[model samples]
Target: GSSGSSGGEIIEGCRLPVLRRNQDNEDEWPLAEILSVKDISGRKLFYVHYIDFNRRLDEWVTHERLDLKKIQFPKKEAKTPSGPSSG
Candidate 1:
């Protein structure tokens, strides 16, 4: 899973998979696994594992939609906003 900042940069391997919430549909979120890792400059990169329901197989997938709140970096690198004023 991979998430990007507002500037659209990769943010140095700071990515996570978030649960999908589509109340109208019955689509299920696929389970994700970390398959590999890479180093781009000083940033660590990760390759993800995905299940392909269409073929009933496993595949490696990469995308920008993988951003999850749980995968955020430490406060020292990227601190959470304290309040509305922090924004």
Candidate 2:
């Protein structure tokens, strides 16, 4: 829980990061843009769209499954291309 960060401002229309839902995409952490935020029935949820340097995949998510933290850039240089010459 990052005070004044994730649990702070909703910061509408901002880009954030979210974790993959299942083991199928476990190692993949997708980025999301917060289109809107609201509290319904005491449950906080976010309306968002996703993209991993690709396209905005529009979807709905909750605070638990979604990460509202400010996403850092470059993503650690993508860990380089492993075994390009393995062929």
Candidate 3:
């Protein structure tokens, strides 16, 4: 996987298309840009942006996924300790 650092923060992870190719060929995945991120209480939600595929050129298409695994903290941290537990 590839990552980039800008504005003093570290951004990691690969684009969907690059990740798929890496899974098939065992090669490194390319880096992508992060559009935005929101903090719901303490949990983080990310909005990633990437280039569109060129159908005429036969380029692979890239799409976004809501990667909760990339979240800095668990959902529980976003809730009040006195509230009911979350699974």
Indicate which candidate wins on lDDT: 2
| lDDT of model number 1 | 0.45
lDDT of 3 by residue, 1-87 (tens): 224333233234333322334445764333333444556675544444343542232232223333323323212335433645775
| Local distance difference test values of all predictions, in order | 0.45, 0.62, 0.37
Model 2 C-alpha lDDT per residue in residues 23-81, reported as the tens digit of each score = 66564557777777788897877787776665546777777756544543223344544
Better of 2 and 3 by lDDT: 2
Give residue 74's error in model 3 in angstroms.
29
**Per-model RMSD to reference:** 10.8, 13.8, 14.6
Residue pairs in candidate 3 whose N, alpha carbon or C atoms collide under 3 angstroms: none
Candidate 1 TM-score to native: 0.30
Taking the tens digit of each residue's C-alpha lDDT, what string does model 1 give over 17-81? Answer: 52343487654455444455556686545555443444443333344435553454324455454
lDDT (Cα) of model 2? 0.62
- Among all windows of 10 consecutive residues in model 3, the one with the lowest summed lDDT is 54-63
